[PDB]
């Protein structure tokens, strides 16, 4: 009823992802009635939108085994859009695309051990030649070259974000191999799907932050000024920083992060300077979000704080907050676990005058969190997460994450005699048999702890 | 059950050390069935791993008087491996060894008083000539030269850590004699065998620190992020610093020590600089451990601390803790005797979110501690350490060490009339007759003190 903003809404161009029959990295398939509905001719360059602000440029073709409201794409495209089979995606016409001038690609390290020969000659040239491939900056793509398959990242493009790779396009693969861990920590990146039992609050954040920045016209038309300071509060480990990361990755707005301790660690004056630089940067760049994490570190009650520099910072912040005129289109978000220790001046009208309580999860919420945490864990049949959700009365997300870590450590302990600390590598069979059992969770539960 | 990680496990190449029949420094002996089991031909160069990350390179020969699961090696090899008879060692094939280019050896000072003549001509040349000896950097080896025996240290090698000494190999013995006290303070170096009544906890430290650094694949395969901040706590004198020294000497990881007071002793800003330098160094160097000893010195509750530089340091630390991304492979360990005085921000998820309680030893633990302390003491038949363990209720390791020191002082007092404070040297007979009696311990016990 209030939650209405979160609802997906059906559109002509909003389609479900199905497995591809055409296994090319550049190709997406649609049913013929759907192509006509969207005025898409065969072989047109299209823009697809996935989760966490991710995009891919593809060339569209007609398929008959494909349903009307479905789209077919391989793993490579699904990866780039950070989507799995069943997720909804946007499809957009894209006749804007320039022919590429210069691109910069690099291989992923672990998929490149043994023989250089020539990476461009063996792999990239046969992949691109006369194919007129659309590629986007940040794409990870797989190429076979007789022997095996190498993954490459698009690091740079000379036409702004995306281009067509013509014979003209100079293909550079100069630098060091891109580290596996870099790109896995890039897949790691937090989205709204990684945040559990916070539906009501996520809806509030989209209302107060996302809505007025993407559609200022609504608030201006109705005759209402958008609130400009939103403060997330709640007990330690409920998900504030996690939401911070999610927003950063999920928004159309330019995002600027400030960590409380990161500011207070700096020299006298050089801290006030970074604060100004943050606000000046946000004002300069588009509709923007400034996230002040751990606000109580920078803005405690001016009455009860010893240092002159510490008092000067609170004053610096207040001045910045009021320094933004309406037409700046900058919203300031902040998170704390002790809201009662922040200077009341900052919680006045026009400053942080809106509050979102990220509280303790209910039984239902805990279940969401356990499902979110265990999505990469190997679990057994007998593991009942609903059971674990109910037995965790005082637990917040951080306690549940830790519980999952200790359940997993127990399963490692059960496999100990087949493992030793001294050998270089762990046995292959032992690695595959690793499942976290219900019994492990009951051991984790017996050890667990509140607040 | 939980202690499973500490268990040693039987392997084909894990052998018990027996006394050698072949008394050459370069030679180890095995039974003929065991050499076939490990595909080791006669006279192959082998790598031996001992305690405290110690290694020796030997040439392997077949022995018949030797049992299947035993290895024969002299005192020189046992010293270099820091093992006594009955300890288990690894044996590894080693066909990698290059011929040496340049080696640097130096004599141990107290074994070299009177006549230089020439050390290479009299000692080293006849020891190495046509022998093709494997040697490792850091090896201490004894050589006889007609008259007497001189100990030498391998200070440097031109092929990286170990090489074969061929006729080509230039043998330098240039510098000052290596000091006895330095090499005895090197044997002094603390390992896991020097820490008593702490089995459960050592298992915890190996789980949380050693296992994720040596085997990150396990945690990544199971789908779990390894905890990155471990805090040792407990009353004064329980063995925290002792464990820190043990870990430093025992791990495969690069180790960096930070002492609380050592940091706070520095000029404003130059202390923050050293904290950064420690993290940048640890990030630069392999899998790494950073040990912040006496944490409560640098990180007290920001709420109750007077100086601006003191507040700025806690902020500097928090930022660094969060500054490590998952893929850094750096665990931070810390020790304190007042855990409740640390800023709670530091003890949150992602920071020092794991705790190891080094508490008061039980009766069994005290006995372990007494056995570890008195391993170099001269004791009498009537000394019952089990009796002493039982009468020491409130005692921690530091109290027990102190008790041992006072017991020994009492035995010195018993010998006083045959000693005087004025004479240059103490009589030789008086030195040998020194034994610490049970009576001395009962005097020590009479004087003892809790907490
Ligand atoms: N509601 C939640 N949904 C999913 N995961 C969560 C949630 N809350 C906590 N977690 C997990 O716990 C971890 C720590 O939570 P944080 O986001 O750091 O909590 P926090 O609210 O920022 O705590 P403070 O106030 O900084 S002590 C996250 O990385 C998540 O893995
Ligand atoms: N568990 C133990 N096993 C063997 N010796 C110990 C043990 N605990 C203490 N000792 C001895 O007592 C000495 C002092 O112990 P420390 O390791 O300094 O204690 P600590 O826990 O670091 O105390 P704080 O908190 O720094 S006052 C050590 O050098 C050991 O000789
Ligand atoms: Mg947080």
UniProtKB/Swiss-Prot annotation, chains A, B:
Disease: Inclusion body myopathy with early-onset Paget disease with or without frontotemporal dementia 1: An autosomal dominant disease characterized by disabling muscle weakness clinically resembling to limb girdle muscular dystrophy, osteolytic bone lesions consistent with Paget disease, and premature frontotemporal dementia. Clinical features show incomplete penetrance. Frontotemporal dementia and/or amyotrophic lateral sclerosis 6: A neurodegenerative disorder characterized by frontotemporal dementia and/or amyotrophic lateral sclerosis in affected individuals. There is high intrafamilial variation. Frontotemporal dementia (FTD) is characterized by frontal and temporal lobe atrophy associated with neuronal loss, gliosis, and dementia. Patients exhibit progressive changes in social, behavioral, and/or language function.
Protein name per Swiss-Prot or TrEMBL: Transitional endoplasmic reticulum ATPase
Full-sequence portion shown in this chain: 12 to 462 of 806
Underlying gene: VCP
Residue numbers of Phosphoserine PTMs: 2, 26, 451
Effect recorded for residue 305 to A: Does not affect methylation by VCPKMT
Mutation effect (residue 75 to A): Strongly increased affinity for ATP. Strongly reduced affinity for ADP
Phenotypic consequence of residue 303 to A: Does not affect methylation by VCPKMT
Effect of residue 148 to H: In IBMPFD1; without frontotemporal dementia; abolishes enhancement of K-304 methylation by ASPSCR1
UniProt keyword Cytoplasm present: yes
Variant or mutagenesis effect after changing residue 240 to Q: Impairs ERAD degradation of HMGCR and does not inhibit interaction with RHBDD1
Outcome following mutation: residue 221 to E: In IBMPFD1; increased ATPase activity; no defect in ubiquitin-dependent protein degradation by the proteasome; impaired autophagic function; defect in maturation of ubiquitin-containing autophagosomes; decreased interaction with CAV1 and UBXN6
Sequence position, cross-link Glycyl lysine isopeptide (Lys-Gly) (interchain with G-Cter in SUMO2): 7
Family, as annotated: Belongs to the AAA ATPase family.
Compartment(s): Cytoplasm, Cytosol; Endoplasmic reticulum; Nucleus; Cytoplasm, Stress granule
């Amino acid at each position: 009823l209030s939650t209405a903003i979160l609802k997906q809404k059906n559109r002509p161009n909003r389609l479900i992802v199905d497995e591809a029959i055409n296994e090319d990295n550049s190709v997406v398939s649609l049913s013929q009635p759907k192509m006509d509905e969207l005025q898409l001719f065969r072989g047109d360059t299209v823009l697809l939108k996935g989760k966490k602000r991710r995009e891919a440029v593809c060339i569209v073709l007609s398929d008959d085994t494909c349903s009307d409201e479905k789209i077919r794409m391989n793993r490579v495209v699904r990866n780039n859009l950070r989507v799995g089979l069943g997720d909804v995606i946007s499809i957009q016409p894209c006749p804007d695309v320039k022919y590429g001038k210069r691109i910069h690609v690099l291989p992923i390290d672990d998929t490149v051990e043994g023989i250089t020969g020539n990476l461009f000659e063996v792999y990239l040239k046969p992949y691109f030649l006369e194919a007129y491939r659309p590629i986007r900056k940040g794409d990870i793509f797989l190429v076979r070259g007789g022997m095996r398959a190498v993954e490459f990242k698009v690091v740079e493009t000379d036409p702004s974000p995306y281009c067509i790779v013509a014979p003209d396009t100079v293909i550079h693969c100069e630098g060091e191999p891109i580290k596996r861990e870099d790109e896995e920590e890039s897949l790691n990146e937090v989205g709204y799907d990684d945040i559990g039992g916070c539906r009501k609050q996520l809806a509030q954040i989209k209302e107060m932050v996302e809505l007025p920045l993407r559609h200022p016209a609504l608030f201006k038309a109705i005759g209402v000024k958008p609130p400009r300071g939103i403060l997330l509060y709640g007990p330690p480990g409920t998900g504030k920083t996690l939401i911070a990361r999610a927003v950063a990755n999920e928004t159309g707005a330019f995002f600027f992060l400030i960590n409380g301790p990161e500011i207070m660690s700096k020299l006298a004056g050089e801290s006030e300077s970074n604060l100004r630089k943050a606000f000046e940067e946000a004002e300069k760049n588009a509709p923007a979000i400034i996230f002040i994490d751990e606000l109580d570190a920078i803005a405690p009650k001016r009455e009860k704080t010893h240092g002159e520099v510490e008092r000067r910072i609170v004053s610096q912040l207040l001045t910045l907050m009021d320094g933004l005129k309406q037409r700046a289109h900058v919203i300031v978000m902040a998170a704390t676990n002790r809201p009662n220790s922040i200077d009341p001046a900052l919680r006045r009208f026009g400053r942080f005058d809106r509050e979102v309580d990220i509280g303790i999860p209910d039984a239902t919420g805990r279940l969401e969190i356990l499902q979110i945490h265990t999505k990469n864990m190997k679990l057994a049949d007998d593991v009942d997460l609903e059971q674990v959700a109910n037995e965790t009365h005082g637990h917040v997300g951080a306690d549940l994450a830790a519980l999952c870590s200790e359940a997993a450590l127990q399963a490692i302990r059960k496999k100990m005699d087949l493992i030793d600390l001294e050998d270089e590598t762990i046995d292959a069979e032992v690695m595959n048999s690793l499942a976290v059992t219900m019994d492990d969770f009951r051991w984790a539960l017996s050890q667990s702890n509140p607040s």
